[PDB]
Amino acid sequence: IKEMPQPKTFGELKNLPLLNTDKPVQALMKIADELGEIFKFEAPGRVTRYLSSQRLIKEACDESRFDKNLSQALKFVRDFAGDGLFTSWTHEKNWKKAHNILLPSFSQQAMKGYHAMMVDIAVQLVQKWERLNADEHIEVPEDMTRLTLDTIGLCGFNYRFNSFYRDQPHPFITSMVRALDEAMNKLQRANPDDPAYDENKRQFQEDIKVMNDLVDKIIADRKASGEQSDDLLTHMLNGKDPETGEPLDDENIRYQIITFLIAGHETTSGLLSFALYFLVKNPHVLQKAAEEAARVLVDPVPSYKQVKQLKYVGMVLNEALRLWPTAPAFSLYAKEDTVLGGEYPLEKGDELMVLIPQLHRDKTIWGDDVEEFRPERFENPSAIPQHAFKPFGNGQRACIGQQFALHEATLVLGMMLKHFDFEDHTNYELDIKETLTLKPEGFVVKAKSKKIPL
Ligand code: HEM
Ligand SMILES: CCCCCCC(=O)N1CCC[C@H]1C(=O)N[C@@H](Cc1ccccc1)C(=O)O
C-alpha cells in the first residue's frame, strides 16, 4: 500500500483554489501529467481521488465494487434536472423506472424512426452554408449547437426551436445556459454565502422557474391534444415500467425532457466541433473521410442504411472523442471497503473521479503517438481493451443517448464532407471552453460548396 500524491495546497482551502479557473478539466489534466495515474484532491469537507490510468479505471468500472456518484457539479445540475436519468442515484426508484421505460426508445433500432427528423435539421444546416456569400465564414460550435438543440427538440417532443431562423436563443435556452453557467461556477467558490453571489442565486431560481413552466406547458398541451407523434414525449406518456408496472409521473417526465435538452445543446455539438477541428488540421484524414462521404451518400437525402456505412466517419468521431471527450469526467463511490490497484485502500462511500481525457492518453494502451489524430486506431474495434475508451461513461449508468448522438454526428459530418470543402482560413489556435462540456471556442472555417444538389 502506497501514499497517493496531492497537488499544491492553499492552507485551510486545501486544493479548492486549483478549480478557480475558467478551464478546470484542463488544469486537472496538467496535474495528472505531473502526478501520474492517481492523486488526492481535498476541499473543505470533501475529498476525492482523480484516476488517469486504464489499470485503475478498469477496476473503478467494476459495478460490483463502485456505483455512479453525483459529483458536486451534478448535485448543482440536479437543482434543475431533478431525478431525471442523468442526476438520479442508481438506488432512487425513478432511476430504474425511467431506464426500463426509455431504453427501447434509444436503441440502435429506434434510430430508424428518428432518422427523418435528424435529416430535416441536417438539411437546414447544409442550406445555411450553401447560402453564405463568398466573403463569409462559419462559426462552427455556434452552428453545431443550433443543429443538436433542434434535433433533440424535434425527436424529443416534436418541438421546433427554429435555431437557424434566429440570432437570439429561444427563452428556455437562455435560462438553461445561464443555469448551467451558475452550477459550474458554484464549484469554484472560496465563499459561496458571499453577497456578490446574491444576484446569481436570485437569477438561478428564476431560470429553474422558466425551464419548468415551459416544459410543464408542453407536457400539459400534449395531454390536452391526444396527439401521438413518434417522439420521446409520446413514449414517456404511454410507456409502463415492466418491473413496477407504473408509467413516469408528469414531474419526472419534465426532468427527463430538461435532461435531454441539456445533452443535445452540450455534448453532441462539442463532438461535431472537435471532429471538424481535427479534420481541417489533418488534411490526409479529411480526404479519406470526404472520399467515403462522396462514395456512400449517393442520394440527395441520406438513408439510415447509408449512415451505417460511413465507417471511417465513425472512426473520425471516435478519435475526436478519444482526444477531447466532450463530457470529460464522471464520478464513482465505493459500495464497500475495497483496495484499488492492490495499493490504495478505500472505505465504503469514498469518491473517485475518472479523468476521461487522461485515460484516453494512457501510452501503455495507445502507444507513444497519443496526441496524434489517427482515426486508423479504431479500424478494428476489438483491438481496444475493455475500459480503455469511455467517452459515454460506464455500465448501467453509461450514456443512454450514445446511439442517438453517434447517428446524428455520423449523418451530419457525412453530409458536411459530401457538400463542402473546408478551409482553416484563420489557422485557428485550439481554445477549449468548459461549461458542463468541452467545446472549441472561436473555431471558424470557410466552406467552398461542391455544388451538389439536395
Ligand atoms: C457525444 C455526445 C454525448 C456524450 C459524449 C455523452 C456522454 C455521457 C456520459 C459520459 C454519461 C455518463 C455520465 C456519468 O456517469 O455521470 C452520459 C449519461 C447520459 N447521457 Fe449522454 N452523452 C452524449 C449525448 C447524449 C444525448 C444525445 C442524450 C439524450 C438526448 C444523452 C443522455 C444522457 C443521459 C440521460 C444520461 C444518464 C443515463 C443514466 O444514468 O441512466 N447523452 N452521457
Ligand atoms: C457528464 C459531464 C459532466 C462533467 C461535470 C463537470 C465535472 O465533472 N467537472 C467540472 C470541473 C472539473 C470536473 C470535476 O472534477 N468536478 C468535480 C470538482 C470538485 C469540486 C469540489 C471538490 C472536489 C472536486 C465535482 O464536480 O465534484
Curated annotation (Swiss-Prot):
Impact after mutating residue 187 to Q: Higher activity in the hydroxylation of highly branched fatty acids
GO MF, one annotated term: oxidoreductase activity, acting on paired donors, with incorporation or reduction of molecular oxygen, reduced flavin or flavoprotein as one donor, and incorporation of one atom of oxygen
Impact reported for residue 263 to C: No effective fatty acid oxidation. No effect on electron transport from NADPH to FMN
Technological use: This protein is a target of protein engineering. Its selectivity-directing and activity-enhancing mutations have been extensively studied and the designed mutations allow this enzyme to act on non-native substrates and/or in order to enhance production of synthetically desirable end-products.
GO CC annotations, alphabetized: cytosol
UniProt keywords, alphabetically: Cytoplasm, Electron transport, FAD, Flavoprotein, FMN, Heme, Iron, Metal-binding, Monooxygenase, Multifunctional enzyme, NADP, Oxidoreductase, Transport
Effect of residue 81 to I: No effect in binding affinity for laurate as substrate. High coupling of NADPH consumption to laurate formation. No indole hydroxylation. Favors omega-2 hydroxylation
Predominant location: cytoplasm
Disulfide bridge partners, by residue number: none
Annotated region (Cytochrome P450), positions in chain: 1-454
Outcome following mutation: residue 400 to E: Ineffective covalent modification of the heme macrocycle. 2-fold apparent limiting rate of flavin to heme electron transfer for arachidonate-bound enzyme
Effect of residue 81 to W: 800-fold binding affinity for laurate as substrate. Low coupling of NADPH consumption to laurate formation. Very much more effective in indole hydroxylation. Favors omega-1 hydroxylation
Induction: By pentobarbital. Expression is negatively regulated by repressor bm3R1 at the transcriptional level.
Site (Important for catalytic activity): 267
Consequence recorded when altering residue 73 to G: Higher activity in the hydroxylation of highly branched fatty acids
Annotated (9Z)-hexadecenoate binding sites: 50
Residues annotated to bind heme: 399
Keyword Endoplasmic reticulum: no
Substitution effect: residue 329 to P: Enhanced activity with small non-natural substrates with altered product profiles compared to wild-type
UniProt family annotation: In the N-terminal section; belongs to the cytochrome P450 family.
Entry function: Functions as a fatty acid monooxygenase. Catalyzes hydroxylation of fatty acids at omega-1, omega-2 and omega-3 positions. Shows activity toward medium and long-chain fatty acids, with optimum chain lengths of 12, 14 and 16 carbons (lauric, myristic, and palmitic acids). Able to metabolize some of these primary metabolites to secondary and tertiary products. Marginal activity towards short chain lengths of 8-10 carbons. Hydroxylates highly branched fatty acids, which play an essential role in membrane fluidity regulation.
Protein name per UniProt: Bifunctional cytochrome P450/NADPH--P450 reductase
Residues shown, of full length: 3 to 456 of 1049
